[PDB]
Design an enzyme around this catalytic site. Structure first.
Site, mmCIF file in Angstrom:
data_model
loop_
_atom_site.group_PDB
_atom_site.id
_atom_site.type_symbol
_atom_site.label_atom_id
_atom_site.label_comp_id
_atom_site.label_asym_id
_atom_site.label_seq_id
_atom_site.Cartn_x
_atom_site.Cartn_y
_atom_site.Cartn_z
ATOM 1 N N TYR B 135 21.350 -18.508 -43.406
ATOM 2 C CA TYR B 135 21.889 -19.311 -42.298
ATOM 3 C C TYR B 135 21.895 -18.534 -40.980
ATOM 4 C CZ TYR B 135 25.570 -22.216 -39.898
ATOM 5 O OH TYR B 135 26.340 -22.949 -39.006
ATOM 6 N N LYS B 163 18.159 -21.908 -42.838
ATOM 7 C CA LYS B 163 18.789 -22.932 -41.995
ATOM 8 C C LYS B 163 18.684 -22.263 -40.630
ATOM 9 C CE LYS B 163 23.207 -25.153 -40.605
ATOM 10 N NZ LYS B 163 24.552 -25.455 -41.216
#
Lengths: 293, 295, 295, 295
Positions: B135, B163
């Protein structure tokens, strides 16, 4: 009741399994007391509070109060991103007998200045009488307070001091000019002498754990008009800071304390890694010269 | 398990006492499933993970798993500053039946890239087989990774997705070019269509909770070469994001969901304040508008 | 008087002594015309305007007009920190027959927004009829305009376009939404396809000097709904930009143009240094590849 | 020549038509000499160098040397983005009899550190014997030099000083520690006392034009260990800087000089606008206070 002074930002010793090393924590508290430190700032950034749970932070506060209550000033950093969690720590700090509480500006999520004010107001309420030390550290929090916003925070009922961890000495002077009686802590150890000159009347720092008397010496030298001694002590402090920044600050400090027979295991909690072995000789040499001081 | 797709970053409902509102959480999970969302990203920034304790995050992970396991993909965001805390959450996600785990680059304290790597490796070990979604959110974490560092993280054994919450679409394209098979999620809802065009093959976002079908619609429109429809949809999404940024994003989304009869109390946890009353009419009108787009 | 399109930000060729290489400047103008470029943006950042005197910039504007007036659109970047200097350039651009003028937001010294507006108004007055293209490049100018300030700038009387050299595609979309008829140029070549999708309707870029037809190709591909082609072309442009960023952009472009027999001496003015010889093989190969692309 | 000391960053007076006001430039030079300033730094940022042509900058250098050569130290800021332009000014500084030259790190375009070093070496050569004052001002130039790079710069043959316009006093101390004999100027007037304490041995500042004796007073007080007086003076200076920042620093200074009957017209060049009339009484009062301070 006077919060002015030189307060060490206490480190949190951990054992081999990364659990709190209680014996080392007690030794560290006693060690600081013997240096002539004015007080301890507990559970702050330096104490690795953000890699600890609430109960772990409470345990540290409880133990430090046991060891130091009534001997030196005790400021409990109770800040969390969450107001509720911060209030719980504040209530615990009141219960354990701390002299004051402190909270870093809540981070990660953006909050309006009004939300920051309400966060402090709520913690002050839970501190139930303990004065609050607003903690400003833009470089870490990402929160950039304007002078005007700072003026509002330090005038909130219940606020008794400002830990200014900012290298902007123009702002340090402006804050002093605006608040002649405010307890204003210099937060960047590497500019302590200059910060006092700009208006701070004390400081809170991580390096005070291993050489707090040098900072007390700077305060005294400036009071006496002994510029040379103030500059020489700051220079020695910065030579040390240069090394700690290369090694990693908290891990470097704990390593020095380990060589001083205070901390059993100098590790920080993951994701912090260990100190690169290539720096151990300089850290051991530093511990030796500090012990001979 | 194919992790490509449009996944809502699930919000965490709370009540007036700031406690987790379990009934609203279950309703919200079902609402997302009913939207045709491909999956849910649980306990992330959007779920207000950072104002929750590990036990609270675990309770949320378990309840969502109970409600949706096997129906849609479930990604558990287990990231904390602490590696040990993140590992505990990772072990719980595995136990509850999640399909993957995710962790924001550790923040507040500066860590070397090698430390970030060891952090993910340690979490991957505790995830015991669940793929990891790295992330990246520079704007919030303050961690600025280079393309090369990103390349290293994405190639760590056990990492199956990224992400990418960065508005840098040059970097988005570069990542796609260097990793043709990588599951790459667009993180900023407001540039979703442009993000897909640059190389993302899906996305994770907070606004999907209230209009996930619009993003699925952008995916389909681009898949068919209908640029006009893709642009039309993105523009509508952005009109909504404009409003949410003014109202406060999470609280605004919860308020829309409250008007949609999903969330009982649209509160975020302190220090987040309540939505300014002057915005309620527009948020209620938005809820009505969105409810109509579903037929 | 239509300013929409793909316009190359013209480079300024110099001779071995760093003085303007007129023959190469004329060849480059012709080369760009021959590629099918819609226009030229002259004397901008790419033209090394900021390492040139006022008289040198005027000489370049005058020569480019001689070569291209009436054949393609001509935009004169007349921006300087000083308003008076910018006005002199604007007056010269009018005299030379340019179609429009442009000015980067005054930099180095911090100016108030009202000061920026008065700057543009004064230049517009001196342009006497030539519309103004506001030039926003935060990464270089350090001037971070807000969406509302941008709205005030593009609505100033005499302003006919905005060169948006920002990678924020949410803002690009917001600008298009607020101004449906605005001529809006994508300024970062590496996100051209995504910027058009977000709302730009053309672009101004340095790399157009060597592969302008690819960007025209992206415009056409999107206009026809052929996303695959647009992406493939953007990918190819980005492989080149990856290289140019490594080599130094202006010097890398000039080196490729040297191997295409357009630029005699590919140097930039000091303090820019020469291209690292380790990149000459890739730059030589790129020049070959590009020449083969046009049959 | 000893370059240590308190040097005013000289402003450039303009007349009603914004041309150089030579007569006022001469009087301002004499006014500075009369307050006991150690020297003048000419044609710098404060001198509005970046809104002047090369010929105008040379004209100012020539006039200042005429008025002050041999009376106080003279440093010519010859910095331009262009190396050749900087060299021309450096040769002029040499011809006019200046004691040193200085150059801001070239800005706007990103240059590598090697390029910055070559830029200084070239100017040093053209300065023909005049030592170079490296000028570091990250907040304006956008150039973020590391301490290691600063060390390389200050040890280049021909470099005799560093104008450190940075508020980082840890770095100020590190520089002093690494270079005990280096002439180190504090560049932010608002932290002068603290900067000296950290290791600077002098300073270059814009506010010295109106109250240079106060800074000399801080130098003297710190040398005598009189902390209280140094702080009191710095506080008085900061009250003035607080006002100047609100009014616009250069225009504010010029206005005070106008009220002190030093500068004929207090204008800055466009795009700087005029001082907001609401501040004139405070500036006039400041001028009166400063005049009363001289007896």
């Amino acid at each position: 009741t006077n919060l002015r002074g030189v307060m060490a930002a206490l480190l949190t010793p951990f054992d081999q399994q990364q659990a709190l090393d209680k014996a080392s924590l007690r030794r560290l508290v006693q060690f600081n007391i013997q240096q002539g430190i004015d007080g301890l700032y507990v559970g702050g950034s330096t104490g690795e509070a953000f890699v600890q749970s609430l109960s772990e932070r409470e345990q540290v506060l409880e133990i430090v109060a046991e060891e130091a209550k009534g001997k030196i000033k005790l400021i409990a950093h109770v800040g969390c991103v969450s107001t509720a969690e911060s209030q719980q720590l504040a209530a615990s700090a009141k219960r354990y007998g701390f002299d004051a509480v402190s909270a870093v500006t809540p981070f990660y999520y953006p909050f309006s200045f009004e939300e920051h004010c309400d966060h402090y107001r709520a913690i002050i309420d839970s501190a139930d009488g303990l004065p609050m030390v607003v903690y400003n550290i833009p470089a870490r929090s990402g929160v950039k307070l304007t002078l005007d916003q700072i003026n509002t925070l330090v005038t909130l009922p219940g606020v008794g001091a400002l830990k200014q961890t900012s290298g902007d000495l123009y702002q340090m002077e402006q804050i002093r000019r605006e608040h002649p009686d405010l307890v204003l802590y210099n937060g960047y150890d590497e500019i302590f002498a200059s910060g006092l000159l700009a208006g701070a009347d004390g400081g809170i720092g991580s390096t005070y754990n291993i050489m707090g008397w040098r900072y007390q010496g700077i305060v005294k030298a400036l009071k006496e008009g002994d510029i040379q001694t103030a500059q020489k002590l700051q220079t020695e402090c910065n030579k040390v800071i240069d090394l700690l920044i290369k090694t990693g600050v908290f891990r470097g400090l704990k390593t020095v304390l380990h060589y001083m027979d205070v901390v059993s295991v100098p590790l920080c909690r993951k994701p912090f890694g260990p100190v690169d072995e290539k720096y151990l000789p300089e850290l051991k040499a530093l511990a030796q010269q500090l012990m001979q001081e």
